[PDB]
Amino acid sequence: GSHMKMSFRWYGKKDPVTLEEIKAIPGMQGIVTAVYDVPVGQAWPLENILELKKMVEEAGLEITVIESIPVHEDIKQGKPNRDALIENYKTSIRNVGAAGIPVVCYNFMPVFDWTRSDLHHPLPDGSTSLAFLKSDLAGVDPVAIIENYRQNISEEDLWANLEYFIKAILPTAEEAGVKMAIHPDDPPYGIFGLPRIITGQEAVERFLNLYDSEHNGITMCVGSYASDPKNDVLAMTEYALKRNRINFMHTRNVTAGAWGFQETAHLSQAGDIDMNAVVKLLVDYDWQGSLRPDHGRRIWGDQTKTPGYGLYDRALGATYFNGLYEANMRAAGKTPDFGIKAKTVGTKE
């Protein structure tokens, strides 16, 4: 039976947005977070993870997803020493499973996790947002590693580097009781001479096949995949759902074409994704997992710094998914759940 927990990204103690505020989002159940006191490729201790879990649980929430045990560039490059960094990744997986967190989200995006030309590109209602203007600058070197990928490492080398990775970690994830969920490339194609392989349906199928298990699944980030129109989110969503290989949902809306892309409000008609169709799919497939609204616009006085991570519009995206999820749950004669245990504190009949 279906079981989708609303979740929200939270960067810990140093987050502009707090747990009180997050907790106040109607229907919010999960916290998506990570350890920030340890360098990339170095291995997360249990206590670190546990400190976060305690903060989150006292606030009346739970950590449902570690979003992002970062992958060291040595691993991605496929350099000689990877083995050591991978043993650290194995330790991290183990420590997350030790903490009781079911999913770990990661990426295999060489040197860049994402690219944005504009972090304040206005929208037809007064609100700013992030865009990828294919015209602007794009075609200029970002003022050792780069040339390596450019000169030496092909997409198939990256495919072989990734396969090595996932063959090395997967049994650990199995033993830990933890499911891996690879985040696609953002933008979902090669830029700056750098290669990208997690880019579309063909890529997803080849990925899942590297190690065939539920513990080896995807973060269906619909607004990344559909950043390149060449991609069709819904069949992607569905094949993945048909295969039981979606382990995390991200659900931001974006408008795209031959010209490139710009992130919009989550509403289906604000951009190019049919959001109702997405969750209708989760409904039909009795999907069990977490979804975050992912990214927001700047609206109101939102003085949250960090890119699409202001509380306000992401909140406005979550309740929109409450709507879509509840309606579709009901249309299917299913009864939706939002983790609400009490309506009131101190009254009752």
Next chain:
Amino acid sequence: SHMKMSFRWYGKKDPVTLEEIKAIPGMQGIVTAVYDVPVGQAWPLENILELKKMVEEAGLEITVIESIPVHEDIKQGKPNRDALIENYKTSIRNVGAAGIPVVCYNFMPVFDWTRSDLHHPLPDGSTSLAFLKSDLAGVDPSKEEMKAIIENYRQNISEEDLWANLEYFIKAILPTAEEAGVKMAIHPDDPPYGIFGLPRIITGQEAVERFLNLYDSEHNGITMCVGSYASDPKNDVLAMTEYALKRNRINFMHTRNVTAGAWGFQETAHLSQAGDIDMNAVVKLLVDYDWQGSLRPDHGRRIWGDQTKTPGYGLYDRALGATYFNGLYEANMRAAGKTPDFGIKAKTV
């Protein structure tokens, strides 16, 4: 079959701005009134225009006017009522002289609402308005004037008297309103039973049938505030909603959520499971019947340090409600076979 998401704005003085209101996805209609004319006296075009101009420039539109307030003297049926009704006559005409097609208003002796507590705690740590009967048991409610206004209603004006006062008012103003294009929509009694020995008549299904029948004309309508009605458990808002739709008699919409008992009631998050109303069933019916008019998220919780001190009128939870209704709308539309729509012209600049 187009519902236009809307939102109350309290004029130039509202700490909520139209920038902010326009920023909510899918938000089209604004909802406001004039605030510089005492109460009974006539509403000049100069005043309603100057607010319509303030809003039209902001990319938004007036869809409904929240309240030309009926004077106590009209409510009490005092002899001096005719002139007051006069001044009310032109308000309807001046407002029709602005394209604005709906006017909400109440017929509630003394107060327009009553709460015992304006920061009652909810389980998630947010706060909301609550009416708790037992806490208003002790209380005895110008100042020397209201006392005597209360004495008059208690001792001298009975329910039937107040029906009569209303009927007089209705048959007076309706042709005036059919003459101006404007549709009238009566805000239900809030709460919908006698407090402090004062009478209330707009309280349930019966009242509805009767009220409609005072002037069987599609311009004589209700504001279906499901929240006000569900505050009394004896009421079935789903049935009440449908009944009134089959008669083409919903001219405006308050979609607020409450939980309720013999103990009173408490406003909640708009999300169904947070309260006692199945908002999905509601919006579904609005869909099934092709209802055309504007729906409005009523009160919201106090969340995220919102300082706004007008009842339930901060921006945040109100907006979180709206986008949740976008999601309910869109989903139910597609589930029918119909195709939704919001304020959306251009996806991008």
